[PDB]
């Protein structure tokens, strides 16, 4: 049976695979795509692990709700221009607002997308990459805000792929 | 409701396919990968969060002595007999009939899943042509016709294996 702690550990692996595949897809597009941090563009050590495959599948859903979340995150980041010095507080504001009226799978996956976009943003304008920090923000938020528990109740991260 | 042999037989495909996925996720880490694997083995099944998917996962990760002993003996057998796609049905039927001749118990039920995995792997490795759908049919049908699905139903269904 799936524990909240196991879900929290799995979140790091899901997120790292997710960001790799999000940026792979972004390059396969029109335009050049913002440069990504070499860490974000490094293939996971075990891309075919269960959590690697979950992150991959979540990144390649191009349904309308995911594209809507992504566009709104982009717009917010372009306006707010967070930096490495204030990205923690920015992340906490956006994530807390997103879940304030409840948890659902679309919002869980949207938080991975926001982490991807926040890490990519800070890298552009910043002195270096910020992927490890954003990973900690996402993992810790999901644990503290009872999202890891919510996922565990539903069977763990693999349940994000169910219809 | 009172679990039927028909429901169990229907459930067995999902149990077996999840079992195979989680068995091959361990074999690759232990043996390395010097030939491409069967994509059907290495790709997470659809609806990976179901009760039956969870049963297959738990049975694949058991890892005690009796399950290791069944697995070693199946591998020795296969390495000697070298069944092919042309004769795997007859070879499966012989091994499975022998295994259950003197009775059904949970260790033998799980052993049959292990044998199906190893048979599908062996046949694939011969030609790099997948054989998982065929072996799944062999396992599902054998359990049904040989009253193993009914034995399982009468202990409460697959979910009894979780105990």
Swiss-Prot record, chain B:
GO terms for molecular function: BH domain binding; channel activity; heat shock protein binding; identical protein binding; metal ion binding; porin activity; protein heterodimerization activity; protein homodimerization activity. A motif (BH3) lies at residues 55-69. The keyword Repressor does not apply. One of its GO terms (biological process) is response to mycotoxin. It is a single-pass membrane protein. Zn(2+) binds at residues 141, 145. GO terms for cellular component: BAK complex; Bcl-2 family protein complex; cytosol; endoplasmic reticulum; mitochondrial outer membrane; mitochondrion; pore complex. A motif (BH2) lies at residues 150-163. A motif (BH1) lies at residues 98-117. Keywords: Acetylation, Apoptosis, Host-virus interaction, Membrane, Metal-binding, Mitochondrion, Mitochondrion outer membrane, Transmembrane, Transmembrane helix, Zinc. It comes from the Eukaryota. The keyword Transmembrane applies. Homodimer. Formation of the homodimer is zinc-dependent. Forms heterodimers with BCL2 and BCL2L1 isoform Bcl-X(L). Forms heterooligomers with BAX. Interacts with BCL2A1. Interacts with RTL10/BOP. Interacts with VDAC1. Interacts with GIMAP3/IAN4 and GIMAP5/IAN5. Plays a role in the mitochondrial apoptotic process. Upon arrival of cell death signals, promotes mitochondrial outer membrane (MOM) permeabilization by oligomerizing to form pores within the MOM. This releases apoptogenic factors into the cytosol, including cytochrome c, promoting the activation of caspase 9 which in turn processes and activates the effector caspases. Belongs to the Bcl-2 family. Intact BH3 motif is required by BIK, BID, BAK, BAD and BAX for their pro-apoptotic activity and for their interaction with anti-apoptotic members of the Bcl-2 family. This is Bcl-2 homologous antagonist/killer. It comes from Homo sapiens (Human). The gene is BAK1.
């Amino acid at each position: 049976s799936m524990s909240e702690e196991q879900v929290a550990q799995d979140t790091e692996e899901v997120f790292r695979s997710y960001v790799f595949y999000r940026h792979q897809q972004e390059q396969e597009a029109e335009g050049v795509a913002a440069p990504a941090d070499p860490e974000m563009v490094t293939l996971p050590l075990q891309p075919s692990s269960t959590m690697g495959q979950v992150g991959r599948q979540l990144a390649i859903i191009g349904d309308d709700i995911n594209r809507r979340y992504d566009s709104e995150f982009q717009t917010m980041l372009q306006h707010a221009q967070p930096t490495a010095e204030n990205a923690y507080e920015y992340f906490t504001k956006i994530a807390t607002s997103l879940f304030e009226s409840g948890i659902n799978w679309g919002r869980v996956v949207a938080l991975l997308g926001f982490g991807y976009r926040l890490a990519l943003h800070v890298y552009q304008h910043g002195l270096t990459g910020f992927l490890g920090q954003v990973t900690r923000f996402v993992v810790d938020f999901m644990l503290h805000h009872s999202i890891a528990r919510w996922i565990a109740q539903r069977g763990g991260w693999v349940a994000a792929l169910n219809l």
